[PDB]
Symmetry: D2
């Protein structure tokens, strides 16, 4: 069971990426048991990052670790290919992309052709990122059987959906991307890519270790606390809340998200910290 | 009753915008009776265009006409503001943006703050572009009541939703963005922003003229044909099919869309042309 | 253009149908221009009515008028067939049914077989009632082309959907069932089946007469008022509000709906009447 | 961990319930390790059953066991209350209902008042049946906090939604109603109400026993097979297919479903049996 972190991209107040904070953050996550870093994913504001910002994120993280999966998706296949060619010359775990997005009603063959082009040029293992609620498309096994897929990150609240890949794609590693299903993924799939690893990494690593010891009740209790947090964060914007919580739980500044993913105001951040306080104590009591 | 065209962005085989073809195309549309041009819209591949590409489209079109609505949306508010400051220097119809997109579950206040920032800096009338099927969000009238909105392009199959803006926002011009509801829009709203104006402009202009003469049956008859076209185009990818039809119907080359919006292959194009031929005859018979 | 009323079913406080009020209500609607009555439809609580209640509704109304379309749907085809055989012996306009409901994931052939059985035994014209938001199924033309369909009531906010039937089913009468699209239906389809005819029949008949005279602006203004009413009624329960409004606008008691379609409390009914007052005056000013 | 069966209602060729087959079937299920029976559920054709039919199913089953959850829902609260008063006289596990259905856009208070009325008159523990895909409504925990709820059957593919009830309603027993999530439910909730218990009860009982022994891999392996079955059944109509499989797997005839839930033709049945045969072998090999 692997615990992969879709790392956040720290920005300063002017909306410029702070690579020092990114490296400090990554080192800490890795020291605490995180198995790999998914760069430029949804939590990392991937689609909001320019071609060069995606590249600079990889370069910065490449000075810290080799355990990197590079997400390269954009709405111009020329730019995507430029990022694949760039990453070919580096020693990373894999290259990834979510499907074409924004435009509705694109024929399925477009999705297929998109991935075939990435597969044709990449010299790295291919990780399909399936996120229907975000892109508007569900990549079906029909298209995946044709491609050299190594792993799939499936963001879907229906575990049966993630499990269907495991069955139809022999040998492919499947990871579910929801924080609210970690316990179930750790008992049925190859791991998880969970946004919450950004601020409670020790908690998620503890879940896997408890499950490895056969202590499921304990792992389920941690999951219940996680699901309560997730429920509180919705009203503030889950990604935006994460920045405040990393500082709260981990003790270092990771800056702010970049608008339209607006940062929490001072009041919102103070309000958030009050709501989560009881969950904090209870989590630190079970994980120390 | 205004007939607005979301003009396509001509690209060459390498994916570079061809601004000469953009000008030739826009000029023909105006001569055929199109009243204004929505620049960098969905049909124009807006979200897939870089900041610079969006700017050059506006510069190019400005030479042809000033009846331009400048769509500037992106997932980095700083780039949006940069385009707004740039357009403040020019004499145009207005500035527009669709809502933030991709990221699901963003709080409503985020959408409000995004539009507030455009308004704060813009010296042009604001045109709100609502396309829930694409962005994942519906901009309710409640958010628009505080902004200096002059126009709303509403791409929604429910005409009552478009009429709702009319009712709740006095003095605001509302245009529906669906090709399949043109007839109804010309009988209730302030106009239409229909992608089919790119290849059958004279048909849509003829519908308005027939309606103004009281010949609704004839206009409705033209709508039936338009809706049959829409069904055929879906299979090929509507935007991609438009590039092929512009050449067919108008006589000049507007190039290709840019992948992930894949161009039709020569086989596909020839297949499309045969399939729409009977409809093309019925069209060119009712619209001399 | 026909104006069909999906008549409400009056109940007393004990949940028993009051046929005298039903007849009084029907006479008034017919005197005011309503062209036909759709019995046991959604507004008439069809699926909540027992086999015998559906039969008694038809018998009672049959003492008032011959212009009746009899909706007979239930989750036991034996009961549906018993109602079709019963109605065969009476002189009415047609027999109707919405699709199988409740159970999700039923194969399309089930819908087909359901209607084929009704078509096999009925000696009356068949009216398909398509209401996807209620049944969970959209009956596609594929199945309708095989059946002897005379008319279709399409409840869908997408007029292009209702218009698609007109085009694919030559000779079939198509009526849209939304109060918020009446104006558009009266300008493109064969009529409407609108719940609001229960309390503002003169208003809807006036819309058609105005459109018949070419006075579209006037007909659109009436539509704007209708859409404002619809928006106010949602919070109370549209069907439940109708009972109170029939009494308000028409001057006779039609009783109450039957739980789970709960009646408005005294306070709710008083609150409703206050909200609609301005719309009343403005409607009675334009229709007297 | 409770394994509950939503028992099918056996009908003869004419559509009359066969209570002898209902008893034979229930007895076999108990002997194979099923713990309780959910009577008149979706799989039991609840909504399609008349008030009297729902009552006779309970009377019949009562002779076999008292571990009965009596589903009483209908679109006439008076009939619901009549069934509740009747069941108050009997010694059963509890009384249940799914929410009001068909009618869309009912206010939330209507759903609350419906359940309040059942609670006011019932002398048995209340089991809330949540099936949004069928009824069109999701019963939130907020409505349940005031009622004396003892159990919740949640048919939802999102396990976090089922876990949410656990977290927000202390002391309430929660069971997930999906065949494709059985494994996960047996590792986190209080049990399952799975329709496949009708034909592969020993498989589901074996999953629980394997889990209790710590053999998760074996239980997960059985889930894969179950999920492959679910895919095959969809095409034929899941409920209808179950009647054919009960005879196949268990050796006695449980008749036919009742139209609109059409029985499989002899050709369809023979086609189903061939398609599931390979899976049946893998099943009967891991479950001696
Ligand atoms: Mg370096
Ligand atoms: Mg009589």
């Amino acid at each position: 069971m692997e615990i992969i972190s879709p790392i956040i991209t720290p920005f300063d107040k002017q909306g410029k990426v702070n690579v020092d904070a990114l490296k400090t953050h990554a080192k800490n996550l890795l020291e605490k048991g995180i198995d790999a870093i998914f760069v430029n994913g949804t939590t990392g504001l991937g689609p909001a990052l320019s071609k060069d910002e995606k590249r600079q994120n990889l370069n910065a993280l490449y000075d810290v670790t080799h355990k990197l999966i590079f997400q390269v998706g954009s709405l111009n296949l020329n730019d995507v290919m430029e990022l694949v060619k760039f990453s070919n010359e580096m020693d990373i775990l894999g290259v990834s992309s979510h499907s074409p997005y924004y435009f509705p009603r694109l024929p399925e063959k477009f999705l297929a052709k998109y991935y075939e082009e990435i597969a044709r040029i990449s010299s790295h293992s291919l990780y399909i990122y399936n996120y229907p609620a975000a892109t508007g498309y569900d990549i079906p096994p029909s298209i995946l059987k044709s491609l050299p897929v190594k792993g799939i990150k499936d963001t879907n609240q229906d575990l049966a959906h993630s499990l269907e890949y495991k069955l139809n794609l022999p040998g492919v590693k499947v990871y579910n991307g929801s924080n609210t299903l970690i316990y179930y993924s750790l008992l049925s799939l190859d791991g998880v890519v969970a946004s919450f690893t950004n601020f409670i990494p020790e908690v998620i690593v503890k879940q896997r270790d408890l499950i490895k010891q056969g202590k499921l009740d304990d792992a389920l209790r941690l999951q219940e606390l996680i699901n309560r947090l997730a429920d509180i964060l919705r009203k503030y914007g889950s990604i935006s809340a994460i920045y405040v919580l990393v500082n709260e739980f981990q003790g270092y500044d990771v800056g702010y998200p970049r608008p339209p993913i607006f940062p929490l105001t001072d009041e919102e951040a103070l309000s958030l910290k009050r709501e989560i306080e009881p969950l904090k104590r209870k989590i630190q009591e079970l994980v120390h």
